[PDB]
Design an enzyme around this catalytic site. Structure first.
Site, PDB file in Angstrom:
ATOM      1  N   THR A 199       0.951  -1.192  -0.030  1.00  0.00           N
ATOM      2  CA  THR A 199      -0.052  -0.166  -0.066  1.00  0.00           C
ATOM      3  C   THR A 199       0.749   1.237  -0.185  1.00  0.00           C
ATOM      4  O   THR A 199       1.712   1.337   0.695  1.00  0.00           O
ATOM      5  CB  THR A 199      -1.010   0.107   1.235  1.00  0.00           C
ATOM      6  OG1 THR A 199      -0.092   0.226   2.356  1.00  0.00           O
ATOM      7  CG2 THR A 199      -1.563  -1.271   1.490  1.00  0.00           C
ATOM      8  N   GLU A 202      -4.089   5.494   1.442  1.00  0.00           N
ATOM      9  CA  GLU A 202      -3.230   4.621   0.984  1.00  0.00           C
ATOM     10  C   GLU A 202      -3.782   4.103  -0.194  1.00  0.00           C
ATOM     11  O   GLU A 202      -5.191   3.665  -0.474  1.00  0.00           O
ATOM     12  CB  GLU A 202      -3.105   3.578   2.021  1.00  0.00           C
ATOM     13  CG  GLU A 202      -2.502   4.403   3.348  1.00  0.00           C
ATOM     14  CD  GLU A 202      -2.967   3.023   4.638  1.00  0.00           C
ATOM     15  OE1 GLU A 202      -2.541   3.476   5.682  1.00  0.00           O
ATOM     16  OE2 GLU A 202      -3.180   1.999   4.366  1.00  0.00           O
TER      17      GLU A 202
HETATM   18  C1  LIG Z   1      -7.662  -0.802  -0.443  1.00  0.00           C
HETATM   19  C2  LIG Z   1      -7.822  -1.054   0.931  1.00  0.00           C
HETATM   20  C3  LIG Z   1      -8.805  -1.251   1.803  1.00  0.00           C
HETATM   21  C4  LIG Z   1      -8.651  -1.749   3.270  1.00  0.00           C
HETATM   22  N1  LIG Z   1      -9.835  -1.926   3.936  1.00  0.00           N
HETATM   23  C5  LIG Z   1      -9.704  -1.909   5.250  1.00  0.00           C
HETATM   24  C6  LIG Z   1     -11.172  -2.012   6.124  1.00  0.00           C
HETATM   25  O1  LIG Z   1     -12.146  -2.085   5.683  1.00  0.00           O
HETATM   26  N2  LIG Z   1     -10.587  -2.079   7.529  1.00  0.00           N
HETATM   27  C7  LIG Z   1      -9.597  -1.878   8.212  1.00  0.00           C
HETATM   28  O2  LIG Z   1      -9.492  -1.677   9.304  1.00  0.00           O
HETATM   29  N3  LIG Z   1      -8.257  -1.719   7.357  1.00  0.00           N
HETATM   30  C8  LIG Z   1      -8.282  -1.566   6.199  1.00  0.00           C
HETATM   31  N4  LIG Z   1      -7.406  -1.697   5.357  1.00  0.00           N
HETATM   32  C9  LIG Z   1      -5.996  -1.979   6.088  1.00  0.00           C
HETATM   33  C10 LIG Z   1      -5.528  -0.556   6.733  1.00  0.00           C
HETATM   34  O3  LIG Z   1      -5.075   0.486   5.533  1.00  0.00           O
HETATM   35  C11 LIG Z   1      -4.000  -1.025   7.295  1.00  0.00           C
HETATM   36  O4  LIG Z   1      -4.320  -1.093   8.708  1.00  0.00           O
HETATM   37  C12 LIG Z   1      -2.714  -0.300   6.975  1.00  0.00           C
HETATM   38  O5  LIG Z   1      -1.844  -1.016   7.544  1.00  0.00           O
HETATM   39  C13 LIG Z   1      -2.481   1.083   7.575  1.00  0.00           C
HETATM   40  O6  LIG Z   1      -1.419   1.981   7.308  1.00  0.00           O
HETATM   41  P1  LIG Z   1       0.205   1.349   7.444  1.00  0.00           P
HETATM   42  O7  LIG Z   1       0.243  -0.014   6.824  1.00  0.00           O
HETATM   43  O8  LIG Z   1       0.899   2.233   6.940  1.00  0.00           O
HETATM   44  O9  LIG Z   1       0.245   1.274   9.192  1.00  0.00           O
HETATM   45  C14 LIG Z   1      -7.252  -1.519   3.685  1.00  0.00           C
HETATM   46  C15 LIG Z   1      -6.317  -1.219   2.942  1.00  0.00           C
HETATM   47  C16 LIG Z   1      -6.306  -1.085   1.841  1.00  0.00           C
HETATM   48  C17 LIG Z   1      -5.148  -0.669   0.695  1.00  0.00           C
HETATM   49  N1  LIG Z   2       1.505  -2.211  -6.777  1.00  0.00           N
HETATM   50  C1  LIG Z   2       1.914  -1.593  -5.595  1.00  0.00           C
HETATM   51  N2  LIG Z   2       1.033  -0.719  -4.997  1.00  0.00           N
HETATM   52  C2  LIG Z   2       1.112  -0.016  -3.887  1.00  0.00           C
HETATM   53  N3  LIG Z   2       2.513   0.245  -3.593  1.00  0.00           N
HETATM   54  C3  LIG Z   2       3.636  -0.361  -4.259  1.00  0.00           C
HETATM   55  C4  LIG Z   2       3.202  -1.393  -5.310  1.00  0.00           C
HETATM   56  N4  LIG Z   2       4.287  -1.974  -5.657  1.00  0.00           N
HETATM   57  C5  LIG Z   2       5.319  -1.578  -4.788  1.00  0.00           C
HETATM   58  N5  LIG Z   2       4.792  -0.836  -4.035  1.00  0.00           N
HETATM   59  C6  LIG Z   2       5.623  -0.093  -2.933  1.00  0.00           C
HETATM   60  O1  LIG Z   2       5.171  -0.418  -1.707  1.00  0.00           O
HETATM   61  C7  LIG Z   2       5.393   0.291  -0.774  1.00  0.00           C
HETATM   62  C8  LIG Z   2       4.605   0.239   0.696  1.00  0.00           C
HETATM   63  O2  LIG Z   2       5.228  -1.050   1.200  1.00  0.00           O
HETATM   64  P1  LIG Z   2       5.173  -1.194   2.822  1.00  0.00           P
HETATM   65  O3  LIG Z   2       5.876  -2.460   2.897  1.00  0.00           O
HETATM   66  O4  LIG Z   2       3.539  -1.333   3.192  1.00  0.00           O
HETATM   67  O5  LIG Z   2       6.002   0.050   3.200  1.00  0.00           O
HETATM   68  P2  LIG Z   2       5.197   1.085   3.921  1.00  0.00           P
HETATM   69  O6  LIG Z   2       4.727   0.424   5.406  1.00  0.00           O
HETATM   70  O7  LIG Z   2       5.898   2.267   4.500  1.00  0.00           O
HETATM   71  O8  LIG Z   2       4.041   1.678   3.473  1.00  0.00           O
HETATM   72  C9  LIG Z   2       4.741   1.594  -1.448  1.00  0.00           C
HETATM   73  O9  LIG Z   2       5.370   2.872  -0.649  1.00  0.00           O
HETATM   74  C10 LIG Z   2       5.623   1.726  -2.724  1.00  0.00           C
HETATM   75  O10 LIG Z   2       6.764   2.159  -2.900  1.00  0.00           O
END
Ligand SMILES: Cc1cc2nc3c(=O)[nH]c(=O)nc-3n(C[C@H](O)[C@H](O)[C@H](O)COP(=O)(O)O)c2cc1C
Ligand SMILES: Nc1ncnc2c1ncn2[C@@H]1O[C@H](COP(=O)(O)OP(=O)(O)O)[C@@H](O)[C@H]1O
Length: 154
Positions: free
Chosen positions: A37, A88
Site C-alpha cells: 500500500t 493509502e
Molecule cells: C484498499 C484497502 C482497503 C482497506 N480496507 C480496510 C478496512 O475495511 N478496514 C480496516 O480496518 N483496514 C483496512 N485496510 C487496512 C489499513 O489501511 C491498514 O491498517 C494499514 O496497515 C494502515 O497503514 P500502515 O500499513 O501504513 O500502518 C485497507 C487497506 C487498503 C489498501
Molecule cells: N502495486 C503496488 N501498489 C502500491 N505500492 C506498491 C506497489 N508496488 C510496490 N509498492 C511499494 O510498496 C510500498 C509500501 O510497502 P510497505 O511495506 O507497506 O512500506 P510502508 O509500510 O512504509 O507503506 C509503497 O510505498 C510503494 O513504494
C-alpha cells in the site's frame, strides 16, 4: 458483497483528481503481506477529502510514468485526536520497484464500501482482494476506463 459498484457512468463528485508524494507508512510492511500500500503525503489530502466518506474507493493512479487501476483506502490518523485524513493506494496489477518520494497522481472514480472494523490479517486480505476484483469489474465500463487516458495523466 456485490461484484460491481457505482453507476454505469461516472457521476459527481467523481472524478476527483489530486497528486501527492508517496511517503513511508507506519511501519506495517504490507509488501510482504502480498498487498503493498502506498501511503500518500498527508499534506495533500487533508482538505480535499476532509469531508469525503471514509472507506475504499477505486479509479486510476499514475506513478513513474505508468497508469494502473487502483483501490484507495481513506481513513483517519490514529496518532492524533483532531481529525487527520489518511489515504493509502494500492496500484492493481503492477510490476516494478518501489516509488517512495515519487509524485503519484490519482483519479477517484467511485466508492466501494466503508471501513470495516479490523478483524485480523487474513480477513483484511480477503476484503482487499474482493475490493480489487470489484474495482476492475467497475472500471471495465467505457465511461470509467476512458479516464485511463485522462489529460491529468498526460
Ligand atoms: C484498499 C484497502 C482497503 C482497506 N480496507 C480496510 C478496512 O475495511 N478496514 C480496516 O480496518 N483496514 C483496512 N485496510 C487496512 C489499513 O489501511 C491498514 O491498517 C494499514 O496497515 C494502515 O497503514 P500502515 O500499513 O501504513 O500502518 C485497507 C487497506 C487498503 C489498501
Ligand atoms: N502495486 C503496488 N501498489 C502500491 N505500492 C506498491 C506497489 N508496488 C510496490 N509498492 C511499494 O510498496 C510500498 C509500501 O510497502 P510497505 O511495506 O507497506 O512500506 P510502508 O509500510 O512504509 O507503506 C509503497 O510505498 C510503494 O513504494
Amino acid at each position: 458483497r456485490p461484484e460491481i459498484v457505482g453507476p454505469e457512468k461516472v457521476q459527481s463528485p467523481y472524478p476527483i483528481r489530486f497528486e501527492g508524494k508517496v511517503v513511508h507508512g507506519f511501519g506495517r510492511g504490507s509488501k510482504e503481506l502480498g498487498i503493498p500500500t502506498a501511503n500518500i503525503s498527508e499534506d495533500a489530502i487533508q482538505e480535499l477529502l476532509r469531508y469525503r466518506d471514509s472507506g475504499v474507493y477505486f479509479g486510476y493512479a499514475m506513478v513513474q510514468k505508468r497508469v494502473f487501476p487502483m483501490v484507495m483506502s481513506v481513513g483517519w490518523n490514529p496518532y492524533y485526536k483532531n481529525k487527520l485524513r489518511s489515504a493509502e493506494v494500492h496500484l492493481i496489477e503492477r510490476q516494478g520497484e518501489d516509488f517512495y518520494e515519487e509524485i503519484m497522481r490519482v483519479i477517484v472514480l467511485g466508492y466501494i464500501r466503508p471501513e470495516l472494523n479490523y478483524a485480523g490479517l487474513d480477513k483484511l486480505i480477503e476484503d482487499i482482494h474482493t475490493d480489487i476484483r470489484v474495482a476492475l469489474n467497475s472500471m471495465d465500463r467505457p465511461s470509467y476506463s476512458s479516464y485511463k487516458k485522462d489529460p491529468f495523466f498526460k
